[PDB]
């Protein structure tokens, strides 16, 4: 079960051997596991950031530490000299990234929540698509089997922050009697396109 964590490295406390409006100093650390085509190719980036500006990075593609800014020179050289913590990070793509994938894959990669669709007038016809996951989605308007790519405006994808998404796609038209409108949504969470008619 246990989720695994990567540990950052200490900087040398001896650069030269033995011998409220207050200003803020920020240090950020990021372990990025990038997965390509599932787990076929996995890339690990360790990023060290001082005051929003990255100073030194480890890239699995590079296989060693590289300074990003002048501030990062001592860290790259010091850490690269430790030639068996460098070996340790090279196989982190397996021990850390790929491991976390297998553990994670169940409720992240494979997480599927069906969108809720509601259509209502506002001179406007709004198709509301909410509560879905993942974010990749395509929403199209149907006028009784005919679609227009004119007067269509979408809010784009909105991330709610609770592992759900929403989006609103409106159609510019004053709905007359007789005509039939259809909003159709395609998503990985469903096996057949969702239709809601008006």
């Amino acid at each position: 079960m246990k989720w695994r964590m990567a540990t950052p490295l200490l900087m040398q406390a001896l650069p030269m051997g033995g011998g409220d409006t207050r200003p803020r100093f920020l240090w950020q650390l990021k372990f990025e596991c990038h997965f390509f085509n599932g787990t076929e190719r996995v890339r690990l980036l360790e990023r060290c950031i001082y005051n929003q500006e990255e100073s030194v990075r480890f890239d699995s593609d590079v296989g060693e530490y590289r300074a990003v800014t002048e501030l990062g020179r001592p860290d790259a050289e010091y850490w690269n000299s430790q030639k068996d913590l460098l070996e340790q990070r090279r196989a982190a793509v397996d021990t850390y990234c790929r491991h976390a994938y297998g553990v994670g894959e169940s409720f992240t990669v494979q997480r599927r929540v069906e969108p809720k669709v509601t259509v209502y007038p506002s001179n406007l016809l709004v198709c509301s698509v909410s509560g879905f996951y993942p974010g990749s989605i395509e929403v199209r308007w149907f006028r009784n089997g005919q679609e227009e790519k004119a007067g269509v405006v979408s809010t784009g994808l909105i991330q709610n922050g609770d592992w759900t998404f929403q989006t609103l796609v409106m159609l510019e038209t004053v709905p007359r009697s007789g005509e039939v409108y259809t909003c159709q949504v395609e998503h990985p969470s469903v096996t057949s396109p969702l239709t809601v008619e008006w």
Binding site: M5, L10, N37, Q52, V126
Partner: protein
């Protein structure tokens, strides 16, 4: 072709002495570590059925982070962070319909350092009922994101305000929402 990205994001901030530890999956928080209680807090409690995490590991990491921050601060000759003011948007979880339970979302974006005081006002009145918030979410440009939530009962009479304070702001930002 890239498909998914898992990001372990930590930070430390002086002189505030604040720090966080979280995992990010495609922009969504997987979990964070409650430093004071030393417990793993999953974003969705269902996540804890499938996985576990030793919360202690986060505290040790953050201590290494402070350690390296002290060195970086002195090495940079005490160069302070440049403030970046937040972008604020107020939204609802679902389309609002009268007397049917909904949730107000206050989205704070594109800001640094990760320090923000957020207050919810309704009809001029400060509210604390049922409020919640996420940790400071990571960004590729190394800025921050944060979500604030307010469950509410949609009404024609009530009016809401989201007020956000940040050092990068000229004056606090109030963002409005009405039926």
């Amino acid at each position: 072709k890239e498909e998914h990205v898992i990001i372990q994001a930590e930070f430390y901030l002086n002189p505030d002495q604040s720090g966080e530890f979280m995992f990010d999956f495609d922009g969504d928080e997987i979990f964070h570590v409650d430093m004071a209680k030393k417990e793993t807090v999953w974003r969705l409690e269902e996540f804890g059925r499938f996985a576990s995490f030793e919360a202690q590991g986060a505290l040790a990491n953050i201590a290494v982070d402070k350690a390296n921050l002290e060195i970086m601060t002195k090495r940079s000759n005490y160069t302070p962070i440049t403030n970046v003011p937040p972008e604020v948007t107020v939204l609802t979880n679902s389309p609002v319909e009268l007397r049917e339970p909904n949730v107000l979302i206050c989205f704070i974006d594109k800001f640094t350092p990760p320090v923000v005081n957020v207050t919810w006002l309704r009809n001029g009145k400060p509210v604390t009922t049922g409020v919640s918030e996420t940790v400071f979410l990571p960004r590729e440009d190394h800025l921050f994101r944060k979500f604030h939530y307010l469950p509410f009962l949609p009404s024609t009479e009530d009016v809401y305000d989201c007020r956000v304070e940040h050092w990068g702001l000229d004056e606090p930002l109030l963002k409005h929402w009405e039926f």
